[PDB]
C-alpha cells in the first residue's frame, strides 16, 4: 500500500472583490466552509474559512502536517511545492484549488496569484506546476470550469511524453464540473458545494434531502431540526454515527457491484484518503447531476446515480429523521 504527505491547501477567495466575469444581484451570499464571509471583516473571514477547511480535512484523517496559503503569490507556490517534495518521494501530495474569486480558467491556467492590488497578472501554466511537483499526487479543482483544467493537464502530459521520447499518468484528478458548464448560483446552497460533498457528506445529504424532495413523508421535520441532530461521527450508538455507518456501507456496496475489481482495489483498498474521496465523490455525482452539472474524474467510472441501492439510503434517512421530534 501507499501513504500520503502533507496537504497543500491553496485558496483564492479575494473576499470583497467580485470578479469581472460575473454579475450578481441575487441574494446568494452563500456560505464558504459554512461561513458567511460578509458578517466579518475580510481578515477574519479569510482566516476563519482557512481554519474550518483545515478541520474538515483533519476530520477524515490525522495528518503529518497541513500547510495553507490563503494569499498569493507564485513564489510561495514554488517554495511550497519544493518543501512538499523534500518530505516526499513516493507518498502522494494532495492539492486543493478553489478560484472562486478568480476569473474563469483557460488553457494556460490563468489565476490571480500576485502581490497586488488589482493586477491582471499571470498565465500560470499547468506545465510549470507539473514541473514543480513531479511526485505522485492528487488534485481537487473546485472551480467554474475544472474539466478544462483536466483536459489541459492531459494535453501537457502528452507534450511531456513526446519530449521524453526525443510521475505523469500516476496521478488522479477530481473536477467540479465539465469544461463547458458553470457551477450553480442557487440560494441556500454553499458556494463550495463540491468541496462540501467531498468533506462533509452528511450535512449536505441531509440539507439536500430536506430542500429537494417534492413531497415530504415526515411532517414536522425541517432544517431547524436537522441542524440540531445530536451525536458524534465516531460513535455507532448515536444518530449521526448510524448514518455514517449506513452511508459507508451503501457507498462501498455500490462501488463493489459497479467497478472492475482492478479499479476497485486501486481506488478503495490501496489508500485511506483516496478511498474516502471516491466514496464521497459518488455522492457529489448524484447531487450535482440535478443542477445540470457533471463532475469529471481523471479515470472514467460507469454512472452510478442509476443504481437501485440509492433508494435504500433514502428510506433509512426518513426512518432516522422520523425519530428526531
Amino acid at each position: 500500500r501507499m501513504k500520503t504527505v502533507s496537504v497543500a491547501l491553496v485558496l483564492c477567495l479575494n473576499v470583497g472583490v467580485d470578479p469581472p466575469d460575473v454579475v450578481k444581484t441575487t441574494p446568494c451570499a452563500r456560505l464558504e466552509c459554512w461561513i458567511d464571509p460578509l458578517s466579518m471583516g475580510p481578515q477574519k473571514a479569510l482566516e476563519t474559512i482557512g481554519a474550518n477547511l483545515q478541520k474538515q480535512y483533519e476530520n477524515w484523517q490525522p495528518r503529518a502536517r497541513y500547510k495553507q496559503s490563503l494569499d498569493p503569490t507564485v513564489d510561495e507556490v514554488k517554495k511550497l511545492c519544493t518543501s512538499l517534495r523534500r518530505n516526499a518521494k513516493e507518498e502522494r501530495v494532495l492539492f486543493h484549488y478553489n478560484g472562486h474569486g478568480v476569473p474563469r480558467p483557460t488553457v494556460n491556467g490563468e489565476v490571480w496569484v500576485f502581490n497586488k492590488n488589482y493586477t491582471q497578472y499571470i498565465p500560470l501554466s499547468i506545465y510549470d506546476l507539473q514541473t514543480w511537483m513531479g511526485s505522485p499526487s492528487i488534485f481537487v479543482y473546485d472551480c467554474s470550469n475544472a474539466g478544462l483544467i483536466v483536459k489541459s493537464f492531459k494535453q501537457f502530459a502528452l507534450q511531456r511524453e513526446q519530449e521524453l521520447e526525443v510521475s505523469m499518468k500516476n496521478c488522479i484528478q477530481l473536477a467540479a464540473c465539465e469544461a463547458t458548464e458553470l457551477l450553480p448560483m442557487i440560494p441556500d446552497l454553499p458556494a463550495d458545494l463540491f468541496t462540501s460533498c467531498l468533506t462533509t457528506p452528511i450535512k449536505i445529504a441531509l440539507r439536500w434531502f430536506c430542500m429537494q424532495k417534492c413531497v415530504s413523508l415526515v411532517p414536522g421535520v425541517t432544517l431547524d431540526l436537522i441542524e440540531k441532530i445530536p451525536g458524534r461521527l465516531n460513535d455507532r450508538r448515536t444518530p449521526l454515527g448510524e448514518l455514517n455507518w449506513i452511508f459507508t456501507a451503501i457507498t462501498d456496496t455500490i462501488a463493489w457491484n459497479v467497478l472492475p475489481r482492478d479499479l476497485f482495489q486501486k481506488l478503495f483498498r490501496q489508500d485511506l484518503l483516496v478511498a474516502s474521496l471516491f466514496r464521497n465523490f459518488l455522492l457529489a455525482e448524484r447531487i450535482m447531476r440535478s443542477y445540470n452539472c457533471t463532475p469529471v474524474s481523471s479515470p472514467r467510472l460507469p454512472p452510478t446515480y442509476m443504481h437501485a441501492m440509492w433508494q435504500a439510503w433514502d428510506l433509512a434517512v426518513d426512518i432516522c429523521l422520523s425519530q428526531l421530534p
Binding site: 500500500r1 455507532r236 483498498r269 490501496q270 489508500d271 485511506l272 478511498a275
Partner: peptide, 8 residues
Amino acid sequence: ESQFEMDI
C-alpha cells in the same frame, strides 16, 4: 493502517 477500521 487499513483502508477502514472499526470496533464492533
